[PDB]
Design an enzyme around this catalytic site. Structure first.
Site, PDB file in Angstrom:
ATOM      1  N   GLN B  11      24.581  38.656 -34.059  1.00  0.00           N
ATOM      2  CA  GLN B  11      24.039  39.926 -33.574  1.00  0.00           C
ATOM      3  C   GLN B  11      23.317  40.677 -34.709  1.00  0.00           C
ATOM      4  O   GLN B  11      22.201  41.057 -34.510  1.00  0.00           O
ATOM      5  CB  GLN B  11      25.110  40.785 -32.929  1.00  0.00           C
ATOM      6  CG  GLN B  11      24.542  42.121 -32.559  1.00  0.00           C
ATOM      7  CD  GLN B  11      25.543  43.003 -31.870  1.00  0.00           C
ATOM      8  OE1 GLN B  11      26.037  42.671 -30.823  1.00  0.00           O
ATOM      9  NE2 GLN B  11      25.777  44.183 -32.392  1.00  0.00           N
ATOM     10  N   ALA B  99      31.942  33.541 -31.328  1.00  0.00           N
ATOM     11  CA  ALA B  99      32.996  33.092 -32.261  1.00  0.00           C
ATOM     12  C   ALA B  99      34.162  34.072 -32.251  1.00  0.00           C
ATOM     13  O   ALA B  99      35.084  33.891 -33.050  1.00  0.00           O
ATOM     14  CB  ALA B  99      32.413  32.907 -33.649  1.00  0.00           C
ATOM     15  N   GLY B 143      31.160  39.309 -38.672  1.00  0.00           N
ATOM     16  CA  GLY B 143      31.227  38.602 -37.393  1.00  0.00           C
ATOM     17  C   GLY B 143      31.656  37.165 -37.571  1.00  0.00           C
ATOM     18  O   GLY B 143      31.491  36.617 -38.691  1.00  0.00           O
ATOM     19  N   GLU B 183      37.426  41.570 -40.374  1.00  0.00           N
ATOM     20  CA  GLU B 183      36.142  41.460 -41.111  1.00  0.00           C
ATOM     21  C   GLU B 183      36.393  41.086 -42.571  1.00  0.00           C
ATOM     22  O   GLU B 183      35.653  40.277 -43.122  1.00  0.00           O
ATOM     23  CB  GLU B 183      35.244  42.701 -40.937  1.00  0.00           C
ATOM     24  CG  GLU B 183      34.583  42.695 -39.557  1.00  0.00           C
ATOM     25  CD  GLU B 183      33.463  43.681 -39.215  1.00  0.00           C
ATOM     26  OE1 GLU B 183      33.574  44.330 -38.108  1.00  0.00           O
ATOM     27  OE2 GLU B 183      32.406  43.737 -39.964  1.00  0.00           O
ATOM     28  N   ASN B 206      26.793  48.651 -44.792  1.00  0.00           N
ATOM     29  CA  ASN B 206      26.559  49.479 -43.580  1.00  0.00           C
ATOM     30  C   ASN B 206      26.952  50.935 -43.869  1.00  0.00           C
ATOM     31  O   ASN B 206      26.316  51.803 -43.316  1.00  0.00           O
ATOM     32  CB  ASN B 206      27.233  48.904 -42.337  1.00  0.00           C
ATOM     33  CG  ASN B 206      26.283  48.058 -41.513  1.00  0.00           C
ATOM     34  OD1 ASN B 206      25.067  47.991 -41.772  1.00  0.00           O
ATOM     35  ND2 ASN B 206      26.833  47.402 -40.513  1.00  0.00           N
ATOM     36  N   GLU B 254       9.530  35.564 -59.522  1.00  0.00           N
ATOM     37  CA  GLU B 254       9.421  35.949 -60.943  1.00  0.00           C
ATOM     38  C   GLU B 254      10.491  37.019 -61.211  1.00  0.00           C
ATOM     39  O   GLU B 254      11.169  36.946 -62.261  1.00  0.00           O
ATOM     40  CB  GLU B 254       7.955  36.286 -61.226  1.00  0.00           C
ATOM     41  CG  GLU B 254       7.677  36.671 -62.658  1.00  0.00           C
ATOM     42  CD  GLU B 254       6.207  36.893 -62.944  1.00  0.00           C
ATOM     43  OE1 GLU B 254       5.421  35.987 -62.580  1.00  0.00           O
ATOM     44  OE2 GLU B 254       5.845  38.001 -63.452  1.00  0.00           O
TER      45      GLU B 254
HETATM   46  N1  LIG Z   1      23.316  46.937 -39.797  1.00  0.00           N
HETATM   47  C1  LIG Z   1      23.801  46.310 -38.714  1.00  0.00           C
HETATM   48  N2  LIG Z   1      25.050  45.856 -38.688  1.00  0.00           N
HETATM   49  C2  LIG Z   1      25.346  45.248 -37.513  1.00  0.00           C
HETATM   50  C3  LIG Z   1      24.533  45.059 -36.423  1.00  0.00           C
HETATM   51  N3  LIG Z   1      25.214  44.391 -35.414  1.00  0.00           N
HETATM   52  C4  LIG Z   1      26.410  44.187 -35.917  1.00  0.00           C
HETATM   53  N4  LIG Z   1      26.558  44.694 -37.176  1.00  0.00           N
HETATM   54  C5  LIG Z   1      27.722  44.566 -38.043  1.00  0.00           C
HETATM   55  O1  LIG Z   1      28.035  43.191 -38.137  1.00  0.00           O
HETATM   56  C6  LIG Z   1      29.478  43.016 -38.077  1.00  0.00           C
HETATM   57  C7  LIG Z   1      29.863  42.304 -36.805  1.00  0.00           C
HETATM   58  O2  LIG Z   1      29.220  41.016 -36.753  1.00  0.00           O
HETATM   59  P1  LIG Z   1      28.174  40.667 -35.599  1.00  0.00           P
HETATM   60  O3  LIG Z   1      26.857  40.270 -36.199  1.00  0.00           O
HETATM   61  O4  LIG Z   1      28.184  41.660 -34.495  1.00  0.00           O
HETATM   62  O5  LIG Z   1      28.968  39.370 -35.055  1.00  0.00           O
HETATM   63  P2  LIG Z   1      28.350  37.935 -34.737  1.00  0.00           P
HETATM   64  O6  LIG Z   1      27.698  37.368 -35.964  1.00  0.00           O
HETATM   65  O7  LIG Z   1      27.484  38.090 -33.530  1.00  0.00           O
HETATM   66  O8  LIG Z   1      29.707  37.122 -34.488  1.00  0.00           O
HETATM   67  P3  LIG Z   1      30.574  36.898 -33.108  1.00  0.00           P
HETATM   68  O9  LIG Z   1      30.104  37.967 -32.190  1.00  0.00           O
HETATM   69  O10 LIG Z   1      31.984  37.031 -33.544  1.00  0.00           O
HETATM   70  O11 LIG Z   1      30.239  35.502 -32.602  1.00  0.00           O
HETATM   71  C8  LIG Z   1      30.062  44.427 -38.211  1.00  0.00           C
HETATM   72  O12 LIG Z   1      30.268  44.730 -39.579  1.00  0.00           O
HETATM   73  C9  LIG Z   1      28.977  45.272 -37.545  1.00  0.00           C
HETATM   74  O13 LIG Z   1      28.992  46.623 -37.957  1.00  0.00           O
HETATM   75  C10 LIG Z   1      23.203  45.535 -36.464  1.00  0.00           C
HETATM   76  O14 LIG Z   1      22.311  45.453 -35.614  1.00  0.00           O
HETATM   77  N5  LIG Z   1      22.927  46.151 -37.673  1.00  0.00           N
HETATM   78 MG   LIG Z   2      28.144  38.254 -31.519  1.00  0.00          MG
END
Ligand SMILES: Nc1nc2c(ncn2[C@@H]2O[C@H](COP(=O)(O)OP(=O)(O)OP(=O)(O)O)[C@@H](O)[C@H]2O)c(=O)[nH]1
Ligand SMILES: [Mg+2]
Ligand SMILES: CNCCC(=O)N(C)[C@@H](C)C(=O)O[C@H]1CC(=O)N(C)c2cc(cc(OC)c2Cl)C/C(C)=C/C=C/[C@@H](OC)[C@@]2(O)C[C@H](OC(=O)N2)[C@@H](C)[C@@H]2O[C@@]12C
Ligand SMILES: Nc1nc2c(ncn2[C@@H]2O[C@H](COP(=O)(O)OP(=O)(O)O)[C@@H](O)[C@H]2O)c(=O)[nH]1
Ligand SMILES: [Ca+2]
Ligand SMILES: [Mg+2]
Lengths: 420, 440, 39
Positions: B11, B99, B143, B183, B206, B254
């Site tokens: 995501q 996941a 994630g 996390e 974040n 560089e």
């Molecule tokens: N800056 C930012 N952080 C994000 C975003 N979406 C999720 N996060 C952060 O990413 C983490 C969660 O991981 P995600 O990327 O949502 O999870 P995923 O990689 O999709 O993994 P699963 O859903 O478990 O399969 C947390 O720390 C969230 O705050 C986004 O669009 N921007």
């Molecule tokens: Mg996801």
């Protein structure tokens, strides 16, 4: 994606039917299964709970089970009774007579294979099944005994799927059936091993809310089930509406269950039938808990808070930080950031509401109360012959008691545990 | 020639990729249909923007990008959204089941089912490159997909592309927008398994971005959309040297020579200025000296830490817009006499400067003021180890009780992988102490 | 080595879960048999 819903026995089918009435109204589905709502948010995750049929009809992914036909005839006559799939009604004629052994080993074992036929049919047409939710009581024979048998059989065929229960715990204040503590102890022994997540819906707490808070002198099953349906709508909001947090059963389990056996949750709701500070204070109040446990008598391992309605996300974040800061002693220090908050824009006849899901070591109070009532009868072997008559040995009662006392010890172990 | 392939995982990786590619299209005059009227060479060429965009015979400019997620709902918004025509369908890859915030599911159980297809699609992009420089990987630490699938992919890319450069943009977790209690487990597992496979990793806290949005853009409660627009400006500053020409333009490779003194010490601190509302920018022109001064304010950093309490091993300034070297050199001279800038004794103190003349762009409906000049500072500071220390402490609190470890063990992981990952982080924290000690 | 070790361990976790569930079905046969031989 898809969840398969099973409702077993009288309690299971009564709270099950109210669940479908309440969430059908929230998703704009009428009793004939037609969509007549005003928002795209209502349909975006409809497939989690509903199948799509011919003519854009929505059919609950619901299986209705009992050893007695009476309660399922009344479901079929209930307001949303025509929305259920007719082939998803599976009933015997015998009844279980509040006997766990009849539900689990004898009458229930006769019926379970035809229930699994319907579960398999629902499961096979799922794009990607998340898992199962069962509604049942632990105090009767069908919901308790056959409910826990179904869980064991479903797990054997879908061992990598999540198993979630809404389990109604018995109270002398609501039923004067004296073997309820036997049936509840035998059921808890199954739930500890074979579910991932159990919502403890305590008839003790629902009675006390109806009596003390809502000023109902004579609470009926109707009054109790109004609290259950509001809670169940609340704790499934994140599964049913677009959102970030606990949006599927496995993600909820991973956030809420630090040790596999400690999966018994204390649900809460506010308001009981309002500013953000007041929602937040009320959802954490002992008097708003659907389990008769004082959270100030234990520690929170994990919490999910769900706010519903149009409100300030900034105010919700500040208030959620305020409660943790001011009550820091009641949150274990060795699970950092153990309180998660969701906000959904769609409220349930309210402008705003808060639903609380807690994994608290104070839940031991519920198990100790059942354990006390179990022992008082079991020490005189009272009414045991109704259970040995179905082939059970005394030793299976001794094992169920020990496993539930072990669960209490384990909540106590993590309550006393320290970071340093 | 010198193509870069972007890989957006999970995501956070996907939503940040959406914001970056929207911004690159606006920077280069590329329309949502892929057409670029200013490009006179139809169906190919070796302009600087061709590092990130391939060209079809029909004049379409197509991101050199793959988007991967283990569930479909985020990538389905790219498939039906404003930029749907920019991407060929085979660049957008989804599974059915995510996941569930579990590294073990992203790396093993769910990840194994899609990894061969993802490498297939990446190979198709690599085969259209005449001189592939390397990969840019965007993911969350927190994630299950961002952590576990990214680790798997980085390992597989080391096998299939040997030593081709791999750069990461890694989203470090904050409690204000986090979605999982585990996390810290996911962050340490992926940092351990990725560390030998990555040449350079830009961490984005974040919490730092959240605070910059609240404090500098007056956003009461920042969303991912707010955070991602700001992150895309910082990413764009870093990649601008690959996407534009100019005499004073200095290639990112560089800067990397200066930023990575030892293979493990590869985590630059980014600081970006100016971050200002339209209402505050109105009749307030920020000079080269003002935006340069703002790079030494901790409140403008992409990672929360205090460089005034560590040592510099490198300082790079990447300017864009109306900036000439005279104004930069006077800005630096002023800052040297006034700030807490202490280098290690084994590193030269000179700041390395690049200038790209193309001014910053903003996205319509954005929160950032359009400015005439901006700067991204990339520094190699010992202070970035504070971010590891915070995550390691949260890991230790939970792991001492084995809280939630059964979710990982259930997916086939062993406790040994946890203690090995944590030991690698202890050794990393120690490496950052050692490089800051004076020579004997 | 990691993906083989993982596959093995996951399969052993599931096999043990099924072994525990098969012993419940064994115990349930024993209970329905105990009821028969009581009558
Ligand atoms: N800056 C930012 N952080 C994000 C975003 N979406 C999720 N996060 C952060 O990413 C983490 C969660 O991981 P995600 O990327 O949502 O999870 P995923 O990689 O999709 O993994 P699963 O859903 O478990 O399969 C947390 O720390 C969230 O705050 C986004 O669009 N921007
Ligand atoms: Mg996801
Ligand atoms: C006396 N107002 C009627 C109460 C009544 O109808 N109840 C609550 C019945 C259904 C009932 O559950 O009786 C329980 C006992 C109980 O709660 N109470 C109030 C009770 C009930 C009775 C006498 C009592 O002694 C004074 C008491 Cl104390 C009357 C009895 C023996 C009823 C037996 C009914 C069986 O159906 C054929 C049963 O449901 C019982 C079932 O086994 C089964 O397999 N089926 C076994 C396991 C139940 O343990 C029990 C016994
Ligand atoms: N809250 C609630 N509890 C119920 C309801 N119906 C039965 N119960 C409780 O369920 C227990 C008995 O189980 P029941 O479902 O009636 O037996 P079964 O039909 O054999 O599963 C007792 O503790 C009752 O108080 C209901 O509609 N709501
Ligand atoms: Ca061209
Ligand atoms: Mg009944």
């Amino acid at each position: 994606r898809e969840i398969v819903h099973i409702q077993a026995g009288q309690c299971g089918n009564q709270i099950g039917a109210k669940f479908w009435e309440v969430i059908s109204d929230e998703h704009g589905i009428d009793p004939t299964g037609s969509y007549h709502g005003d928002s795209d948010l209502q349909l975006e995750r409809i497939n989690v709970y509903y199948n799509e049929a011919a003519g854009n009809k929505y059919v609950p992914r619901a299986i209705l089970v009992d050893l007695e036909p009476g309660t399922m005839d009344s479901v079929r006559s209930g307001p949303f009774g025509q929305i259920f799939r007719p082939d998803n009604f599976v009933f015997g004629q015998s009844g279980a007579g509040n006997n766990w052994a009849k539900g689990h080993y004898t009458e229930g074992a006769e019926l379970v294979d035809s229930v699994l036929d319907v579960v398999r049919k629902e499961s096979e047409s799922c794009d990607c099944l998340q898992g199962f939710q069962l509604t049942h009581s632990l105090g009767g024979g069908t919901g308790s005994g056959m409910g826990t048998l179904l869980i064991s059989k479903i797990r054997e065929e879908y061992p990598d799927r999540i198993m979630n229960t809404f389990s109604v715990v018995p109270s002398p204040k609501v039923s004067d059936t004296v073997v309820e503590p036997y049936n509840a102890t035998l059921s808890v022994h199954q739930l500890v091993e074979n579910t991932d997540e159990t919502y403890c819906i305590d008839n003790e707490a629902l009675y006390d809310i109806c009596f003390r808070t809502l000023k109902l002198t004579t609470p009926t099953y109707g009054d109790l089930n109004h609290l259950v349906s509001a809670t169940m709508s609340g704790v499934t909001t994140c599964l049913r509406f677009p959102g970030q947090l606990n949006a599927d059963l496995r993600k909820l389990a991973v956030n809420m269950v630090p040790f596999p056996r400690l999966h018994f949750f204390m649900p809460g709701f506010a308001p009981l039938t309002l500013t953000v500070p007041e929602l937040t204070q009320q959802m954490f109040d002992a008097k708003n808990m659907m389990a008769a446990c004082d959270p100030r008598h234990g520690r929170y391992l994990t919490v999910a808070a769900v706010f519903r309605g149009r409100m300030s996300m900034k105010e919700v974040d500040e208030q959620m930080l305020n409660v943790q800061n001011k009550n820091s002693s009641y949150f274990v220090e060795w699970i950092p950031n153990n309180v998660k908050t969701a906000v959904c824009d769609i409220p349930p006849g309210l402008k705003m509401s808060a639903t609380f899901i807690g994994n608290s070591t104070a839940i031991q109070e519920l198990f100790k109360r059942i354990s006390e009532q179990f022992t008082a009868m079991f020490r005189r072997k009272a009414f045991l012959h109704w259970y040995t008559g179905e082939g059970m040995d005394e030793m299976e009662f001794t094992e169920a008691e020990s496993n539930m006392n072990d669960l209490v010890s384990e909540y106590q172990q993590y309550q006393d545990a320290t970071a340093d | 020639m010198r193509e870069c392939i972007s890989i957006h995982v999970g995501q956070a990786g996907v939503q940040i990729g959406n914001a970056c590619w929207e911004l690159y299209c606006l920077e280069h005059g590329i329309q949502p249909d892929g057409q670029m009227p200013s490009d006179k060479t139809i169906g190919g060429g070796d302009d600087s923007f061709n590092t990130f965009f391939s060209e079809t015979g029909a004049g379409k400019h197509v991101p050199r990008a793959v988007f991967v997620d283990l569930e479909p709902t985020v990538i389905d918004e790219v498939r039906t959204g404003t930029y749907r025509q920019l991407f060929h369908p085979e660049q957008l890859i989804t599974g059915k089941e995510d996941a569930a915030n579990n590294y073990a599911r992203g790396h093993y159980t769910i990840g194994k089912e899609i990894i061969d297809l993802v490498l297939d699609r990446i190979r198709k992009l690599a085969d259209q490159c005449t001189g592939l420089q390397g990969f840019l990987v965007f993911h969350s630490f927190g994630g299950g997909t961002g952590s576990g699938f990214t680790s798997l992919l980085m390992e597989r890319l080391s096998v299939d592309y040997g030593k081709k450069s791999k750069l990461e943009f890694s989203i470090y977790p904050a409690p204000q927008v986090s979605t999982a209690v585990v996390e810290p487990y996911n962050s340490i597992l992926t940092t351990h398994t990725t560390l030998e496979h990555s040449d350079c990793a830009f961490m984005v806290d974040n919490e730092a971005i959240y605070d910059i949005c609240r404090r500098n853009l007056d956003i009461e409660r920042p969303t991912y959309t707010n955070l991602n627009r700001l992150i895309s400006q910082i990413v764009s500053s870093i990649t601008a040297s690959l996407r534009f020409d100019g005499a004073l333009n200095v290639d990112l490779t560089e800067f990397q020579t200066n930023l990575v003194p030892y293979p493990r010490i590869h985590f630059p601190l980014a600081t970006y200025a100016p971050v200002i509302s339209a209402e505050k920018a109105y009749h307030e022109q920020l000079s080269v000296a003002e935006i340069t001064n703002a790079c030494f304010e901790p409140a403008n950093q992409m990672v929360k830490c205090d460089p005034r309490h560590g040592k510099y091993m490198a300082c790079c300034l990447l300017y864009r817009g109306d900036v000439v070297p005279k104004d930069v050199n006077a800005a630096i001279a002023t800052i040297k006499t006034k700030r807490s800038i202490q280098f290690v004794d084994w590193c030269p103190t000179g700041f390395k400067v690049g200038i790209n003349y193309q001014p910053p762009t903003v996205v319509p409906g954005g929160d950032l003021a359009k400015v005439q000049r901006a700067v991204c500072m990339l520094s190699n500071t010992t202070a970035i180890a504070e971010a590891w220390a915070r995550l390691d402490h949260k890991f230790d609190l939970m792991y001492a009780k084995r809280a939630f470890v059964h979710w990982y063990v259930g997916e086939g992981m062993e406790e040994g992988e946890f203690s090995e990952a944590r030991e690698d982080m202890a050794a990393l924290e120690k490496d950052y102490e050692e490089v800051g000690v004076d020579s004997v | 080595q990691k993906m083989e070790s993982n596959k093995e361990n996951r399969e052993a976790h599931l096999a043990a879960m099924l072994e525990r569930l098969q012993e419940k079905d064994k115990h349930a046969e024993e209970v329905r048999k105990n009821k028969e031989l009581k009558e």
